UniProtKB/Swiss-Prot annotation, chain A:
Name of the gene: MRPS2
GO molecular function, one term: structural constituent of ribosome
One example of a Gene Ontology biological process annotation: mitochondrial ribosome assembly
rRNA processing is among the record's keywords: no
Biological function: Required for mitoribosome formation and stability, and mitochondrial translation.
Complex and partners: Component of the mitochondrial small ribosomal subunit (mt-SSU). Mature mammalian 55S mitochondrial ribosomes consist of a small (28S) and a large (39S) subunit. The 28S small subunit contains a 12S ribosomal RNA (12S mt-rRNA) and 30 different proteins. The 39S large subunit contains a 16S rRNA (16S mt-rRNA), a copy of mitochondrial valine transfer RNA (mt-tRNA(Val)), which plays an integral structural role, and 52 different proteins.
Keyword Ribosomal protein among record annotations: yes
Clinical disorder: Combined oxidative phosphorylation deficiency 36: An autosomal recessive, multisystem disease resulting from deficiencies of mitochondrial respiratory enzyme complexes and mitochondrial dysfunction. Clinical manifestations include sensorineural hearing impairment, mild developmental delay, hypoglycemia, and intellectual disability.
Family affiliation: Belongs to the universal ribosomal protein uS2 family.
Annotated source species: Homo sapiens (Human)
Source species, domain of life: Eukaryota
Name of this chain's protein: Small ribosomal subunit protein uS2m
Swiss-Prot record, chain B:
Family per similarity comment: Belongs to the bacterial ribosomal protein bS21 family.
Annotated GO CC locations: mitochondrial inner membrane; mitochondrial small ribosomal subunit; mitochondrion
Molecular-function GO term, any one: RNA binding
One Pfam family, short name: Ribosomal_S21
Keyword Ribonucleoprotein: yes
Protein name in UniProt: Small ribosomal subunit protein bS21m
Keyword annotations from UniProtKB, A to Z: Mitochondrion, Ribonucleoprotein, Ribosomal protein
Superkingdom: Eukaryota
Gene3D superfamilies documented for this protein: Ribosomal protein S8
GO biological processes: mitochondrial translation; translation
Lineage: Eukaryota, Metazoa, Chordata, Craniata, Vertebrata
Major localisation: mitochondrion
Length: 220, 86
């Protein structure tokens, strides 16, 4: 058990990019997906200024260099969690992409909550689901805002319950409590599809690498 | 008194529909504020009450114009739910 854990769990933590997530994307791919388009300058959020490249005719432009760095970190974290077999829950209240996100979750073997987030799903989880339920080990927000342009209550609840949160934060979002913010465009279908594909690929790579490493260790 | 008669506030009836003529005249007086002015001048509105009423009407107009702007802005979003079910 000791050696197994030491060589399985802690081995990947010794490498900058163990799962090679940087190859999954490039600044050009994000640009082509339009990850760099934000809302009007009037909708801008005070905490999203550091990630905004500028304002092109009252339209904010998200610094895709910072997006690339943040996306690297978020994808690496997600890959490591999937490798460690944690529960990854995808949250998004964008009804335009509810179906897509649910399908991505089902395909990648993780969970999704794209519906009306009932109060207490995380803070009252033991009562709602059962005393032995296992809460998600990572929450990935494809849209950190609810359908009234307020932060998803899941963000606050995840911070409360100490569940790390990856999250795509647009120029009108509040990245303060999101553990791994990925400044980007969460409203374009192209951008949302790119995010879904990236997270799906990273999680699948992590799971398959976990299986491969386990087989390598157990066969010897 | 010293002006010519039948030029001010005079409307000509078309085809004999005095009801339409009176409606047009009433619209004219109301838009010019004469009806409200007469109603308010029936009794003396003391200056403080007049100022309070003017301020209240200005605030009411600001609020109504802003609410109408919001309604007209959001009216487009009264479409059929495109993502019904999901
Ligand atoms: Mg957005």
């Amino acid at each position: 058990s000791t050696d197994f854990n030491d060589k399985i769990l802690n081995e990947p933590l010794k490498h900058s990019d163990f799962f090679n997530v940087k190859e999954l994307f490039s600044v050009r791919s994000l640009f082509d997906a339009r990850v760099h388009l934000g809302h009007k300058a009037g909708c801008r959020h005070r905490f999203m200024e550091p990630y905004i490249f500028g304002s092109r005719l009252d339209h904010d432009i998200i610094d895709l260099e910072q997006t690339a760095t943040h996306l690297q970190l978020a994808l690496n974290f997600t890959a490591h969690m999937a490798y460690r077999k944690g529960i990854i829950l995808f949250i998004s209240r964008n009804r335009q992409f509810s179906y897509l996100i649910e399908n991505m979750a089902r395909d990648c073997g993780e969970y999704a909550h794209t519906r009306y987030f009932r109060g207490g799903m995380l803070t009252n989880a033991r009562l709602l689901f059962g005393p032995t339920v296992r809460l998600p080990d990572l929450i990935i927000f494809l849209h950190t805002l609810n359908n009234i342009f307020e932060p998803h209550v899941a963000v606050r609840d995840a911070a409360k319950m100490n569940i790390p949160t990856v999250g795509i934060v647009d120029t009108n979002c509040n990245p303060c409590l999101i553990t791994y913010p990925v400044p980007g465009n969460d409203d374009s279908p192209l951008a949302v599809h790119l995010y879904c594909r990236l997270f799906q690929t990273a999680i699948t790579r992590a799971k398959e690498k976990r299986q491969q490493v386990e087989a390598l260790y157990r066969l010897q | 008194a010293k002006h010519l008669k039948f030029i001010a506030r005079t409307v000509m009836v078309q085809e004999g529909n005095v009801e339409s003529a009176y409606r047009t005249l009433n619209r004219i007086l109301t838009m010019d504020g004469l009806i409200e002015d007469i109603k308010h001048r029936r009794y003396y509105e003391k200056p403080c009450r007049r100022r309070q009423r003017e301020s209240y009407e200005r605030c009411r107009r600001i609020y109504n114009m802003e609410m109408a702007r919001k309604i007209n802005f959001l009216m487009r979003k009264n479409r059929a739910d495109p993502w019904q079910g999901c």
